[PDB]
Write a protein that binds this ligand. Structure first.
Ligand SMILES: *Cc1c(COP(=O)(O)O)cnc(C)c1O
Ligand SMILES: [K+]
Length: 431
């Protein structure tokens, strides 16, 4: 076998288990954020819940908590064991962030949160709002006019654009989304139907984000959503940790030393999976084990963490084209901060090809009736990478029994809003 980086260079599916993981206590100083920060995010989303229930009536029945289902997928589990000839110990579950309301992706967590935090900040500073107000008052025509004086910009592939576009437009902000090549036509149409300005290019994610950042700095009433650097996005994602813990409790599922939880997180820039992993660590401690999953054509986070260069190296530095069917994950350079903040708290990083993603996407639809976009399948290959590795199991001291009592949680990150035509194209690609 090649050394790891040569696998990367060759676009071979590969797996790196992190030999420098630490206890939660030993890792926490390096995060730069705390459980108090995470609880402040929960509290902010709770303050906005009465606004959201009215602004987006699809959330009224939970109102307006933005949360997704946690489901068991034992038919898919058996299918994976059949197709890849590797047993999956324990139970396989799926977290359906693909089916979050409003924008149908994990970006409905961090993207939406960042937009709400920005509105709140402006409204507070204007003297228009206090923390103990009923936030549904923000729906008033006066508030919409207030927010119309401010603009938001974002670069995206873009579930992020979709999330920040739809939320910002509903609030009353002017919003422009700078879209990478190609970004799906349906997403641009969807944004334009919400009164969002979209600016189309023909370079990748990093260029779109760069040009979007440039345009927002030209105006003190324009706020750039910076997915490479925003801790606010990260915190919006991290809210998922306690939400999941509460679901596990409700469902009567134990997470402890004897019943470990392994979580498999698709990774673009790292804010999404990093933020979720942080919230998970605070919720479950040393008993949750987190794995990032990237396309073979975009292994930016694995590359950054493995080499210790983080955002100082890109996939293109190693001759990789950053072209993948997994749009949400087609990020060529890791986060400005997530790798350093989180490496001690991440058990491993792996890559999988577009074809693997497409094959699994079809199997999931066949076995479970759940239809996702290719990006959302990246975690699905994780349980078998982990179960096959004797060295990973020995590294962490996992017994046969602990492995039988493991929960494997695949984090689905997008797909619920993909139109039938595009979904049928996805299904046509798998074998
Ligand atoms: C945002 C996104 C991810 C993870 O993205 P990050 O850039 O790491 O935050 C994964 N899957 C989908 C479908 C996404 O939209
Ligand atoms: K990536």
């Amino acid at each position: 076998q090649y050394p790891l980086v040569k696998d990367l260079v060759a676009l071979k599916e590969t797996t790196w288990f992190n030999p420098g993981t630490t206890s939660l206590a030993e890792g926490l100083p390096y995060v730069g954020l705390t459980e108090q920060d995470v609880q402040d995010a929960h509290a902010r989303l709770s303050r906005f819940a009465p606004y959201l229930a009215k602004a987006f009536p699809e959330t009224a029945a939970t109102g307006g908590i933005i949360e997704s289902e946690l489901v068991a997928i034992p038919a898919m589990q058996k299918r994976l064991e059949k197709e890849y000839q590797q047993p999956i110990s324990g139970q396989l579950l799926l977290k359906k962030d693909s089916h979050l309301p409003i924008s149908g992706s994990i970006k409905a967590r961090g993207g939406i949160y960042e937009v709400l935090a920005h509105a709140e900040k402006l409204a507070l500073e204007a003297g228009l709002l206090t923390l103990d107000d009923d936030y549904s008052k923000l729906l008033s025509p006066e508030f919409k006019q207030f927010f119309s004086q401010y603009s938001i910009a974002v670069g995206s592939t873009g579930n992020l654009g979709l999330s920040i576009g739809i939320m910002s437009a509903r609030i009353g902000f002017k919003v422009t989304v700078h879209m990478s090549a190609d970004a799906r036509a349906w997403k641009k149409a969807k944004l334009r139907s919400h009164g969002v300005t979209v600016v189309e290019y023909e370079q990748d994610y990093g260029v779109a984000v760069e040009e979007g950042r440039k345009a927002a700095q030209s105006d003190p009433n324009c706020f750039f959503i910076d997915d490479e650097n925003s801790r606010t996005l990260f915190l919006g994602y991290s809210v998922a940790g306690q939400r999941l813990k509460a679901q596990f409790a409700q469902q009567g599922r134990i997470v402890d030393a004897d019943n470990p939880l392994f979580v498999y997180l698709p990774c673009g820039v790292g804010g999404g999976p990093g933020g979720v992993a942080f919230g998970l660590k605070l919720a479950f401690g040393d008993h949750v084990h987190c794995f990032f999953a990237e396309p073979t054509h975009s292994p930016c986070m694995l590359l950054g963490v493995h080499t210790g260069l983080h955002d100082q190296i890109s996939v293109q530095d190693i001759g990789i084209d950053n072209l993948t069917a997994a749009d949400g994950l087609a990020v060529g350079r890791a986060s400005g901060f997530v790798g350093r903040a989180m490496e001690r708290l991440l058990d491993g990083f792996y890559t999988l090809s577009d074809q693997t993603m497409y094959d699994m996407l079809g199997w999931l639809a066949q076995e479970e009736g759940i239809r996702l976009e290719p990006s959302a399948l990246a975690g699905m290959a994780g349980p078998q990478r982990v179960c096959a590795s004797v060295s990973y199991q020995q590294m962490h001291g996992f017994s046969a029994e602990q492995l039988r009592n493991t929960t494997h949680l695949v984090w689905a990150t997008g797909g619920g809003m993909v139109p039938e035509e595009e979904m049928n194209q996805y299904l046509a690609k798998g074998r």
